[PDB]
Amino acid sequence: KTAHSQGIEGKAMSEEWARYYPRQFDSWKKTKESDNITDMLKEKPALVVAWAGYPFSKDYNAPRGHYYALQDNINTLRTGAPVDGKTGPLPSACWTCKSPDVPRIIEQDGELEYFTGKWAKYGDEIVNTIGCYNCHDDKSAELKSKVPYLDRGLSAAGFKTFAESTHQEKRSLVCAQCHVEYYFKKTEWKDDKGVDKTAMVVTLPWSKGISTEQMEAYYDEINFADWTHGISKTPMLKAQHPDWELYKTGIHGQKGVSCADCHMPYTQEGAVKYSDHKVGNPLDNMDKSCMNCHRESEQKLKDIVKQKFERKEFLQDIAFDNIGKAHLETGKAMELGATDAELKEIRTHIRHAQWRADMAIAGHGSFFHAPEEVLRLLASGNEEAQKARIKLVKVLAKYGAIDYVAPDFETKEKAQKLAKVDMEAFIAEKLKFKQTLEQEWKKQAIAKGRLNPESLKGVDEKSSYYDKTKK
C-alpha cells in the first residue's frame, strides 16, 4: 500500500502529492521549461483560410508544456471574453483536458452537470493545470483514466477498457484521455430536481474504428458538422490532436512501445525505478528516450526525424494550398450565383479533403509517430481537394469566371482578412476579460483554497498576442 491509502485531502492540487513523491513532483513541474509559443497561424496561414468561420481562425498555437495547459486554455482567443458565468463563446467541455479539477468536479456533480453550461461557468473552480490526479488514483497511486468518455470510446471501437488493459497499454491510455480527436455531442437530460438541461458531451468518434476514414464515415452517417465554412459554406469537420489514434498506426505503436517510453522514460537507481515526469520532446533526452532501444548516434537519429518532418511539410503545404483555393473558388462561385445544388458535390470533396489533411497534421507528433499514414492522408486529402477544384473550374466557367485566380493567403494578416477575422477587436476584448473577470477568478480561487499562487509563477507571460519576455 501507499503512505496515503485513505486518499489525499486537496488531491486536485498536485502540490499535495509532493510530500509523498518529491521526485515525480519535481520533474512534473519542470514542464514549465517548455514555454515557447509557436503561432501556427503565422507559420501556416493557409490554416486560417481552412478554418474560416471557426474559432481556430482566430488563434491556434503549437502545444507547449503541461504547466501551461490551463492558462493557455484561458489565454487563447478561442475562448473569447466572457463577462460572467453565463457568457462567452465556448462550453464547459473546454476545461475537460486541462485540469485535475475536472475529475474532481465530475466526481462531485456528475458527468452531465459538468458538461452543462458555459466555459466561464467553472472559471473560479477549474484552476489547476494537468496534474497527478489526472492520471493517478489518490489512494493506490496506480494509473487510471478519470474520464468516462475514453472507456466509452474504447468499447465502441472494440478495444478493451482501461481496467481491462495491460500495464504497458495503460502507459499510453492515460495520455489518451486527452490526446485524441473528439466532438461535442449535444445531449438533453434532466437533473434530480426535474429541470431540463442541455449538455455538450465530449465524445470520441470511434464507433466505427479509429482510422481517419472510419471516423469520416462516422461523422457523415450522422450528418455532423463542426461549423459551416465562412467562405465556401461547406459543412466542415474539425480534427483535434488525434495523437493516440495516429500513433496506433505507427510501427512503435504496433510494436507496443508506449507514449511513456519516449516522453516519460525511466531512470534506474539501484532497485528504484523513476519515471521522468517532465513530459516534453524526447529528442532533448535521446539517451533515455531512444538509445535504450536503438544503437545509433543521436545526431543521425535526429537527422532521420528531421527528414520525416520535411516530408510532411512538403505534402502539408500542397494539400492546404489546394484546400484554401477550393474554399475561395467556391466562395467566388457563390458570389456569381452558383446554387447549393451545383456546389453540393464540390463541398463534399472539400469536407473530406480537409478532414483527412487536418487529421494528418492536427497531431503535431504524427509525422514521426505514424509517418506513412500521415503522408498517405495528406495525399488523399489533396486529391479530394483537386477533384473539387477541377469541378469548380466548370462551375466558374458556367458563370463567366473561368480565369478567376483565388487570392493569395501567404501571411496570417492576409489570410485573416479573407476569413474576415477582426483580430484587433478580439484581442482588445480578450485583454479586458483577463484584466477583470480572470483576475477575479484567480483571486476567488485562491481565497477559497482551490488555487495555490505558487503554481502561477511565470504561467502568464506569453500568448500569441503578447510576450512579457522572460522565463
Q: Which of 219, 368, 426, 441 binds ligand HEC (CB under 6 A)?
A: 368
Q: Binding of ligand HEC at residue 79 (CB under 6 A)?
A: yes
Q: Which does 183 bind (CB under 5 to 8 A by kind): Ca ion, a copy of itself, ligand HEC, none?
A: Ca ion
In order, the DSSP letters of 338-350 are: --HHHHHHHHHHH
Instruction: Indicate which single residue of 183, 219, 426, 433 sits in contact with Ca ion (rule: CB under 5 A).
Output: 183
How far is Cα 246 from Cα 244, in angstroms, rounded to an integer?
6
Is 136 assigned to a binding site?
Answer: yes
Which CB, 94 or 445, lies closer to ligand HEC? 94
Torsion of CA 388, 392, 394, 396, to 10 degrees: 180
Secondary structure of residue 215 in the 3-state scheme: helix
Cα separation, 159 vs 165, in Å, equals: 9
Residue 228 interacts, among Ca ion, a copy of itself, Y ion, none and using kind-specific CB cut-offs from 5 to 8 Å, with none
Task: Name residues whose C-beta falls within 8 Å of residue 2's C-beta, 6 or more positions apart in sequence.
Answer: 20, 139, 140, 141
278 is an annotated ligand-binding site residue: no
**Beta-sheet pairing, 273-275 with 266-268:** antiparallel
Nearest distance from residue 361's CB to Y ion, in Å? 14
Question: Is 54 labelled as part of a ligand binding site?
Answer: no
Question: Phi then psi for 338, rounded to 5 degrees?
Answer: -60, 140
Tell which one of 189, 274, 399, 466 touches ligand HEC (CB under 6 A). 274
Min dist. Cβ of residue 46 to ligand HEC (A): 16
Q: Which of residues 34-53 bind ligand HEC (CB under 6 A)?
A: 34
Q: Minimal distance in Å, beta carbon 421 to ligand HEC? A: 15
Q: How far is the CB of 20 from a copy of itself (least distance, A)?
A: 38
What is the pattern of x (binds Y ion, CB under 5 A) and - over residues 8-27? --------x-----------
Shortest CB 164 distance to a copy of itself, Å: 22
Q: Which does 78 bind (CB under 5 to 8 A by kind): a copy of itself, ligand HEC, Ca ion, none?
A: ligand HEC
Q: Check: CB of residue 386 under 8 Å from CB of residue 322.
A: yes
Give the shortest CB-321-to-ligand HEC separation in angstroms: 22
> In 3-state terms, what secondary structure has residue 293?
coil
**Radius of gyration (C-alpha) of the chain in whole angstroms:** 23
- Using CB under 6 A as the binding rule, whether residue 125 contacts ligand HEC is answered as no
Please, which residues bridge with residue 198 across strands?
A: 188
What is the total count of residues that contact Ca ion (CB under 5 A)? 3
Query: Binders of Ca ion among 236-275, rule CB under 5 A?
Result: 238, 240
Is 369 annotated as contributing to ligand binding?
Answer: yes
**Nearest approach, Cβ of 281 to ligand HEC (angstroms)?**
5
* Helix and strand element counts for the chain (H, E): 21, 6
Residue 394 interacts with which of ligand HEC, a copy of itself, Ca ion, none, CB < 5 to 8 Å by class: a copy of itself
**Beta strand pairing status for 227-228 and 235-236?**
antiparallel
Q: Does 64 bind ligand HEC (CB under 6 A)?
A: yes
- CB-wise, 289 or 386, nearer to a copy of itself? 386
Give the three cell numbers for residue 266.
525511466
Phi-psi region of 271 (alpha: psi -120 to 50; beta: other; left: phi over 0): left
Helices 298-335 and 340-361: crossing angle in degrees, nearest 10, is 170
- The binding site for Ca ion (CB under 5 A) comprises 183, 238, 240
